């Protein structure tokens with residue numbers, strides 16, 4: 011195939027980026043740490059080859075991604091720093107969040123402490139409040155696209171199943187792609203709007219507090235059959251205030267779920283300790299939020 015260049019030049023802004031460390035795959039894309047050859051500032055670079063964009067519909071999805079993502083500015087959204095092309099590749103330059111994602115945390119720590127879940131879910135909801143205010147649905151919020159910066163703030167990225175909503179009342183009849191925490195109105199093909207991201211946040215909330223995802227089996231279609239039936243069980247050691255918020259979010263009817271603006275007014279947040287920050291040791295060891303050291 012075409013090999014990816016070591017220095018990526020944009021002719022319009024006049025920048026050269028050094029391509030550095032590889033970070034992972036995602037579909038047609040490969041992701042690298044990339045850095046400006048003059049100013050040394052480091053970015054995440056999404057690189058898609060044009061060999062995988064030979065059909066117009068795949069180009070249109072790449073255009074829609076860039077269109078959505080470049081219109082976003084928020085503390086809890088991965089910041090878009092530009093896009094460029096060559097004859098073989100599409101390049102997008104994004105905020106590099108150095109502490110990976112909530113998925114890498116989840117694999118190390120399993121279930122988190124309630125204050126940590128409450129911390130991360132607040133910032134997830136704050137970033138999703140930005141999106142829904144701007145009429146963007148994300149549609150694929152998962153642990154592996156909620157990226158953690160060096161301070162341990164959540165950054166929503168990966169706008170590649172995202173969509174704008176163009177008129178009030180609009181149900182999208184189609185979702186091209188397979189989101190991880192797929193909502194029941196998507197699975198049945200009934201039609202969907204903003205509620206799909208609240209569903210996702212409920213599955214994230216379940217996963218962070220329980221340590222395993224809510225519907226999972228060995229078969230993805232039996233998992234979809236469970237989502238269709240609402241076949242899940244919150245274990246009895248989960249606090250009822252948190253289990254109540256999970257149950258509100260993971261309802262099979264979209265219109266019964268809370269809207270994103272309501273979430274932070276829930277009793278789960280408003281009667282719990284929400285840390286102002288978490289230290290780097292929370293990636294490794296469960297915090298024991300002590301009132302004095304020793």
Ligand SMILES: C=CCn1c(=O)c2cnc(Nc3ccc(N4CCN(C)CC4)cc3)nc2n1-c1cccc(C(C)(C)O)n1
Nearest residue numbers: 033034035036041054055056088104106107110154157167
């Ligand atoms: C640029 C493309 C999209 N995306 C982002 O917006 C983004 C932002 N920050 C990051 N940070 C990041 C930092 C380090 C690492 N790695 C460090 C070394 N680990 C062993 C493996 C993972 C990993 C990430 N990484 C980011 N991206 C990213 C990077 C790898 C994989 C994926 C998806 C979700 C598409 O699979 N997305």
Ligand SMILES: [Zn+2]
Nearest residue numbers: 067185186187
């Ligand atoms: Zn399609």
